[PDB]
């Protein structure tokens, strides 16, 4: 029984190598898929020459980052200025468009990212708050009611219907699952085969 022992041995060597290879390859694939961040902190995106840093063109954000002093924000100003006709975009809806079009990110406001990401599913609010800001009631210097503006502003925040208005208008296991299919299928197939064998009987 050594002739068949020769084929049993080589067959074990073969099936073991192919199984070990397959588990290796699936190990490497899942590992690479998991190890990719890919761009979360904004400083990486500033270094990321393959992604496009972008801002609402000639904007207050361009005033912040373009006239900045912090070093990574300074490199962001340099890259935002550098290929700027390829890199800057004016309209906010066009900002969402270039976000939903290619690898360009719209450096939008916080509430801008809020209303957009609540409105649209496939856009992620990457990064944290890069700085602090606030949309304030602008007026001319020495206004006729600037003190009254801040006064009734604190009254309305005390009235809190501003936040009411914020709510009002500013509102694995499936990966490998095909194994179960192959299982059921072959099960039924061999059930049929055994039924055919009973018929033969």
């Amino acid at each position: 029984a050594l002739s068949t022992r020769i084929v049993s041995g080589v067959w074990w060597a073969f099936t073991l190598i192919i199984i070990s290879s397959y588990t290796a390859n699936l190990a490497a694939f899942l590992t690479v898929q998991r190890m990719e961040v890919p761009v979360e902190s904004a400083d990486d995106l500033a270094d990321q020459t393959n992604i496009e840093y972008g801002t609402i063109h000639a904007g207050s954000t361009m005033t912040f980052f373009q006239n900045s002093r912090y070093q990574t924000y300074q490199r962001m100003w340099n890259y935002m200025q550098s290929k700027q006709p390829s890199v800057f975009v004016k309209s906010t809806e066009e900002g969402i468009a270039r976000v939903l079009n290619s690898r360009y990110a719209f450096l939008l406001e916080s509430t801008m990212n809020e209303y957009h990401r609540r409105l649209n599913c496939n856009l992620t609010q990457i990064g944290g708050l890069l700085d602090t800001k606030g949309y304030g009631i602008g007026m001319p210097l020495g206004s006729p009611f600037r003190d009254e503006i801040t006064l009734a502003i604190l009254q309305l925040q005390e009235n809190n219907r501003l936040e009411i208005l914020k709510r009002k208008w500013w509102e694995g296991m499936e990966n490998i699952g095909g194994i179960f299919v192959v299982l059921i299928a072959g099960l039924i197939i061999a059930v049929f085969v055994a039924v055919m064998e009973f018929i033969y009987k």
Partner: protein, 36 residues
């Protein structure tokens, strides 16, 4: 009668599509619009 001006930006000013655009305030509505 104060000149209250803006550049529309969603959704701050909803810029609702009232193709029959009225005058001034009745022209458009939104969060910043109702805030004003």
């Amino acid at each position: 009668t104060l000149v209250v001006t803006t550049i529309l930006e969603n959704p701050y000013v909803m810029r609702r599509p009232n193709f029959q655009a009225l005058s001034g305030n009745e022209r458009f509505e939104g969060f910043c619009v109702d805030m004003l």
